[PDB]
């Protein structure tokens, strides 16, 4: 009955990704946690959606944000890995939009900080972010200097 599978490379992220919500262009009180499981299902069906998308233009199971472990090139050219967010539309009639442009269904699209996401013709929109850290900032300063 779920319309998606998680791939072999699925992993819970360590980065504290959160999803800020807008209702008619104004913010809710708190962002949604987007970093405590490896996949988040968006859809109108409250029985199975992780994040319900109640607008009537939205499909029962509309889109997933899937965390995937991929390669990461370090500044020094040596190899590591990272876990990053990807969105996939599940063949919704009314589409999934990243930064105002629709995506091809059944294909993973990498997501980035500050991306805006909209499902169908919903009056709601979402912005993806994560926090800054002293550790993160020091690490970046080290590599820059």
Curated annotation (Swiss-Prot):
Organism domain of life: Eukaryota
Domain FHA as annotated: residue spans: 40-103
Knockout mutant characteristics: Delayed growth and reduced fertility. Defective roots, shoots and flowers. Reduced seed set. Reduced levels of primary miRNAs as well as mature miRNAs.
Tissue: Expressed in roots, lateral roots, vascular strands of roots and leaves, vegetative meristems, pollen and developing seeds.
Effect of residue 44 to A: Loss of interaction with DCL1
Subcellular location: Nucleus
SS bonds (residue pairs): none
Annotated function: Involved in the microRNA (miRNA) and short interfering RNA (siRNA) biogenesis. May facilitate DCL1 to access or recognize primary miRNAs. Binds RNA non-specifically.
Oligomeric form and interacting partners: Interacts with DCL1 (via N-terminus).
Protein name: FHA domain-containing protein DDL
